[PDB]
């Protein structure tokens, strides 16, 4: 199936004293593999997956150098944005950046991303063609003119279509034992009586990887969304994911209801009944 590599970066200004709190994380699909935290003692990019530990001290030097440079870019940005938005030196603000690439089942380039937010709102994003920018407001428009003049999009396109895809392929091969393994959801159904006339059926999906999954309910073979509750997919903490979907039913009519599970690790979707 499809694969991705993504890096996420957050800086939060500290107006009273010093530099922003900066946290950077890198992922392959739904597996974190690197991190940097400005509050941590090491001041190095650190491994978070066994397969990246195969990389030499040169990799760790280069990645630490880039990530510390990124922290400085965010520090300068927080200052520039305070100016663009006529804000006081007294409040804490946040800058967030995410970039990366998507590849299909053939591991060939599918899509590239490079986007920025200020205080949780869109600021500037590279468009899908990797040639132009979406600037949300006039402050971001001044950034867009600066980046067009310096041909920033061309540099990003080369990394996104090239380097990003090339290194994603490397990690997929190196971490094949886990990265290329799909973990099908372990499913079961629970039943909870609310009164003598109402019951809740809860369909569980546990221990799956990747995180993408669909859980749906049917009544007599027809889709049922009314009287259903679906929780957000959540991490188990061991690298896998969990989700549940519940339906409220009249007591005694449990047999009409079926839960349907779709996941990459299941050749055909699963059906569960009470």
């Amino acid at each position: 199936g499809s694969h991705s590599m993504r890096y996420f970066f957050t800086s939060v200004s500290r107006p009273g004293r010093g530099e922003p709190r900066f946290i950077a994380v890198g992922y392959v699909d739904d597996t974190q593999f690197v991190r940097f935290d400005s509050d941590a003692a090491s001041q190095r990019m650190e491994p978070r997956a066994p397969w990246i530990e195969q990389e030499g001290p040169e990799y760790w030097d280069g990645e630490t150098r880039k990530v510390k440079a990124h922290s400085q870019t965010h520090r300068v940005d927080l200052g520039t944005l305070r100016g663009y938005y006529n804000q006081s030196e007294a409040g804490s603000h946040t800058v967030q950046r995410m970039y990366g690439c998507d590849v299909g089942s053939d591991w060939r380039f599918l899509r590239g991303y490079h986007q920025y937010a200020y205080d949780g709102k869109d600021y500037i994003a590279l468009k899908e063609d990797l040639r132009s920018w979406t600037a949300a407001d006039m402050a971001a428009q001044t950034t867009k003119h600066k980046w067009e003049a310096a041909h920033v999009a061309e540099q990003l396109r080369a990394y996104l279509e090239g380097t990003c895809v090339e290194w994603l392929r490397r990690y997929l091969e190196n971490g094949k034992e886990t990265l290329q393994r799909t973990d099908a959801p372990k499913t079961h159904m629970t039943h909870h009586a609310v009164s003598d006339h109402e019951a809740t059926l809860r369909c569980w999906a546990l221990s799956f990887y990747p995180a993408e999954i669909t859980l749906t309910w049917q009544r007599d073979g027809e889709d049922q969304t009314q009287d259903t509750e679906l929780v957000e997919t959540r991490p188990a903490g061991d690298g896998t994911f969990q989700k549940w979907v519940a339906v409220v039913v009249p007591s005694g009519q449990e047999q009409r209801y079926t839960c349907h599970v779709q996941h990459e690790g299941l050749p055909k979707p699963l059906t569960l009944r009470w």
Partner: peptide
């Protein structure tokens, strides 16, 4: 592997 060069806003 991260992007080799950065750019400020």
């Amino acid at each position: 592997l991260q992007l080799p060069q950065g750019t400020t806003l």
